[PDB]
Amino acid sequence: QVLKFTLDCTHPVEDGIMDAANFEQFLQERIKVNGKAGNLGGGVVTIERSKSKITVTSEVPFSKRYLKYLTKKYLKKNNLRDWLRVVANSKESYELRYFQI
Amino acid sequence: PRKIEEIKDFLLTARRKDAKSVKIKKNKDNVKFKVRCSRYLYTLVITDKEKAEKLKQSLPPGLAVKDLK
Amino acid sequence: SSHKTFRIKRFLAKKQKQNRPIPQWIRMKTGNKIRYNSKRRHWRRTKLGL
Amino acid sequence: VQRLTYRRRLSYNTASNKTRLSRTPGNRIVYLYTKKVGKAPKSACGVCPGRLRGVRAVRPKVLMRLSKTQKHVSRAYGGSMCAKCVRDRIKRAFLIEEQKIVVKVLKAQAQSQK
Amino acid sequence: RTKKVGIVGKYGTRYGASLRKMVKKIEISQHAKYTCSFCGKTKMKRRAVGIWHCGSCMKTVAGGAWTYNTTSAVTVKSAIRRLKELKDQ
RNA sequence: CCUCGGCCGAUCGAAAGGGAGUCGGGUUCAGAUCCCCGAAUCCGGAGUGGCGGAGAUGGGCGCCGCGAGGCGUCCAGUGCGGUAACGCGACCGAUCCCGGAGAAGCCGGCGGGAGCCUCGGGGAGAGUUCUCUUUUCUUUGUGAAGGGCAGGGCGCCCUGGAAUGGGUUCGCCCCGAGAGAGGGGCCCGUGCCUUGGAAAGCGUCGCGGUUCCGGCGGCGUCCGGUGAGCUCUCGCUGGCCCUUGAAAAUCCGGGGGAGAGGGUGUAAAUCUCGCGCCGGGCCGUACCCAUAUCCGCAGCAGGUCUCCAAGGUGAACAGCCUCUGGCAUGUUGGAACAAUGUAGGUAAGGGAAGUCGGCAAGCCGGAUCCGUAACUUCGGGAUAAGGAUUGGCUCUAAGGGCUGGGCGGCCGGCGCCUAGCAGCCGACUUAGAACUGGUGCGGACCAGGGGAAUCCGACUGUUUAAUUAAAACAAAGCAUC
RNA sequence: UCUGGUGGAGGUCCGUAGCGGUCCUGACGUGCAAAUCGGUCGUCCGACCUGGGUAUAGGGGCGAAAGACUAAUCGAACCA
Ligand SMILES: [Zn+2]
Numbered sequence: 001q002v003l004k005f006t007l008d009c010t011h012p013v014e015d016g017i018m019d020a021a022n023f024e025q026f027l028q029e030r031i032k033v034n035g036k037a038g039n040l041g042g043g044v045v046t047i048e049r050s051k052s053k054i055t056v057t058s059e060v061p062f063s064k065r066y067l068k069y070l071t072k073k074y075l076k077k078n079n080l081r082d083w084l085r086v087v088a089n090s091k092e093s094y095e096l097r098y099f100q101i
Numbered sequence: 102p103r104k105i106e107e108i109k110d111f112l113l114t115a116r117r118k119d120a121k122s123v124k125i126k127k128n129k130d131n132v133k134f135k136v137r138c139s140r141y142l143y144t145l146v147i148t149d150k151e152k153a154e155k156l157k158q159s160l161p162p163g164l165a166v167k168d169l170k
Numbered sequence: 171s172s173h174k175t176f177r178i179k180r181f182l183a184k185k186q187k188q189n190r191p192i193p194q195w196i197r198m199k200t201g202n203k204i205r206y207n208s209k210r211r212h213w214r215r216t217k218l219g220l
Numbered sequence: 221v222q223r224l225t226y227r228r229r230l231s232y233n234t235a236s237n238k239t240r241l242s243r244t245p246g247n248r249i250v251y252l253y254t255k256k257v258g259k260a261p262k263s264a265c266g267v268c269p270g271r272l273r274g275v276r277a278v279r280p281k282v283l284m285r286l287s288k289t290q291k292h293v294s295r296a297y298g299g300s301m302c303a304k305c306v307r308d309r310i311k312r313a314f315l316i317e318e319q320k321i322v323v324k325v326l327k328a329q330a331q332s333q334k
Numbered sequence: 335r336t337k338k339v340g341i342v343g344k345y346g347t348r349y350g351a352s353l354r355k356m357v358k359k360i361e362i363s364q365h366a367k368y369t370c371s372f373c374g375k376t377k378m379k380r381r382a383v384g385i386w387h388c389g390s391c392m393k394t395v396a397g398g399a400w401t402y403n404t405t406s407a408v409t410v411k412s413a414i415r416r417l418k419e420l421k422d423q
Numbered sequence: 424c425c426u427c428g429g430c431c432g433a434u435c436g437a438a439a440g441g442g443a444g445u446c447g448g449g450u451u452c453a454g455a456u457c458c459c460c461g462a463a464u465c466c467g468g469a470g471u472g473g474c475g476g477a478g479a480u481g482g483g484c485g486c487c488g489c490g491a492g493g494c495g496u497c498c499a500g501u502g503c504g505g506u507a508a509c510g511c512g513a514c515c516g517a518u519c520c521c522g523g524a525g526a527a528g529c530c531g532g533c534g535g536g537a538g539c540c541u542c543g544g545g546g547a548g549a550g551u552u553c554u555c556u557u558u559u560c561u562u563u564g565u566g567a568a569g570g571g572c573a574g575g576g577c578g579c580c581c582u583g584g585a586a587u588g589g590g591u592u593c594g595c596c597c598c599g600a601g602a603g604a605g606g607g608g609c610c611c612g613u614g615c616c617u618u619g620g621a622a623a624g625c626g627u628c629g630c631g632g633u634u635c636c637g638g639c640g641g642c643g644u645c646c647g648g649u650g651a652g653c654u655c656u657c658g659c660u661g662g663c664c665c666u667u668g669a670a671a672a673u674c675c676g677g678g679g680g681a682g683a684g685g686g687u688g689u690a691a692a693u694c695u696c697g698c699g700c701c702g703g704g705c706c707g708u709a710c711c712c713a714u715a716u717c718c719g720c721a722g723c724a725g726g727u728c729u730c731c732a733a734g735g736u737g738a739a740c741a742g743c744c745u746c747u748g749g750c751a752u753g754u755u756g757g758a759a760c761a762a763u764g765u766a767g768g769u770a771a772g773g774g775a776a777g778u779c780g781g782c783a784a785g786c787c788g789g790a791u792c793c794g795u796a797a798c799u800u801c802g803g804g805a806u807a808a809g810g811a812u813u814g815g816c817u818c819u820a821a822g823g824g825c826u827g828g829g830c831g832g833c834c835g836g837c838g839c840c841u842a843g844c845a846g847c848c849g850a851c852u853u854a855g856a857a858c859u860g861g862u863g864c865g866g867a868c869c870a871g872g873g874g875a876a877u878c879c880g881a882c883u884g885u886u887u888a889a890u891u892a893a894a895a896c897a898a899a900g901c902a903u904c
Numbered sequence: 905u906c907u908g909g910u911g912g913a914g915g916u917c918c919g920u921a922g923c924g925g926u927c928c929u930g931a932c933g934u935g936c937a938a939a940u941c942g943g944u945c946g947u948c949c950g951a952c953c954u955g956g957g958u959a960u961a962g963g964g965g966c967g968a969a970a971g972a973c974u975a976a977u978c979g980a981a982c983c984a
Contacts (some may be wrong), residue, residue, distance in 0.1 A: 104618040232439045245565040264522040267392045273609045280524045280674045282598045300677040344965045352801035
């Protein structure tokens, strides 16, 4: 009854334009459980990273479109919406890809 | 379209000289055997894969068989 | 209108076929006096007897 | 909101231009032209206000492609008279015939004795 | 609700007081439901002028224009019974 | 040749009346419920039976057969079930007769269903991110025809016998001519599931060949809640009428029983049952449908019959702003901002002194709470007249629905829901209060000035299309011939 | 008899669409128009508005009556 959602940042980190560690702290700080930011909702939601693959797990109702809202805000803050887009490559994962010609 | 709930009735419909083709479709939950006749398309819904493979072997000879893959 | 009889349609067919310009070789015929089709009918300008 | 158009050349809201809304497998809303509502037979008695039971309420010309059982009730005067008035005519026929025999016997006995 | 206008309050001031008074009597009788003499139920309404219907026994009777029984009808029925009885006895 | 036999008379008359039967997906530069794909359906024909099923295959007397089951004879059989309402797949039948459907007004009020709008979440894509917003926008299917189940309706049936009258609607209305209660029956079923059906359509992410392959592939097309909401439609029940709101083709049911069938075969006549075979000819179909395809001499501010109808404000299909869709300002542009004009405003102090005349303009205007005269045909006059309030914000009180009542059950005294308690769910208002702004608040939009009298016509209605809308005409009532 | 509800009548009132056409004697008046335009107005469940089909033809028709209308023509149309 737990929800596992993942985020792929392989391409941006290979190019060096993205910091995976900076993403962890952004999602750790600017994330809400029951409308309150910080503290990860008393530890109910957790974030892990492994090789630029940020996984978010929770047991309370948690929607991955909320994460797409958060990653878009991260990209805009870092001036990356002009080269990167967030695409659902699976049922439970998003992936950061470039714009083709 | 008519829904047939018996295998014995399906074999009778398939062996009709009116019958033209048997179309087998595989879904996530069932397999549907469809026999096209002059007036109605007779569909048989089978939820067991073991019985589904048996029906393919017992289909009458000569009748066209198409797999909707 | 779209709803029309066979008699009316055949009448409109004939007026359509006779609304053509004069052929060019007619001017070259010996003793020719026709310079243009003086019976040309435009749909917006002149209406049919029907 | 998607707006609709007539599928036929009749542009007037007549009794034969009635339509309903149907959603297609193409996720479009279209007009479907509906048949008129049929009425079940009214009893031949002339006093019962309600319709007959057991008979399909369809338009008259469709009535000829139904089976006979859908058009009648298994009883004398089945699909033409109600049960209540069929009962009354059985009793009315019997009781009047009984009175006629009584009257004939009474007039025959009176004639013989007078 | 009203002092005297009764059922002809629907006409307001639009006709004379005397004309509204005359039609008041007729409109009460033409819309009243009478007791049916055949079934005993008080359901004898008026279909049209001279036509009276009972909604329980489904009997239609020819009556008066606004009242179920006209006085001329009652006198004639009683007179015909007298003339018939004189013929018989 | 007998028998039957009323045409109660030819024929014409509706592309809005009646009138069997088709709907999804794709396809064009322009066609399409018409072409292709798919799934259906009506009518007509089938003689020389197209195949099944039904009719229709029982009983008695014996004999043999261990007995089952067979041999002979005789007699049935134009189906069957339910107390009933009626039901089942068919379930013979002519002249003749009866009936039904086609086939009925307008208005009101309720209820059911659908479409649309709305609200809470979950996906996919997009917009914004200067700060916030877990946000804002889009999208989130299942045709006809069958089968099943909800749901709606019923003056349909059976038991039974009601006053201490009861049942019940928003209103009514119903009952010893049979209420309430219980149990059934029928009709409609445009709703849901299902066959059709996901293979197709749409969304999104990729991979191909080449101008097109309905290319190929992955994932999805989800779960709920509301309502006097609007529209359509199906019902129920009322009101009005000195107004009672088509006809005929066509189809069906019933009454009767003239006839037909076969003698016990594995049979007959017959069959409105299931499937199978063949056909459906003729004409119309493009497009405009109007501030540019029609009429007005024209691309003419005129005229010309309909259908569908989103968000916000608000009583509203009012006016004002917006979305889907559409457009280019209405047969030209540039510059300037004179007089006179057309259209729209404002004005100190007076306040009709103007003028034939308050013409024109202006005042009033919504809603809530108070308060309303003379006169009167007692209905009205009446929004008479006159007065107060109206914003924003933060609260308070009241107004409802469902479920429950001493691993899973239950044979049980052992429990007692009873000043209606607990939990869960939910929308729209009303009233009161505090605070607050340069007293501003129906802030735009929408939106009656009023009173005292005289003349005429009673009122509503009508009239000189293109100078007269009136006191003229009509009208109900009265009277006369 | 009075009171509070319910109910939803009416050639009922305000007022949209529709139908009509008061006043400005406004605009225009070689017009957009051989009768139109704007504001303001009357009515808006009824003696209501409207399409198609039908019937009545010129000393005739039709007229809730103005000598009105009868194809821009009416105190007897138009055509020869
Ligand atoms: Zn009666």
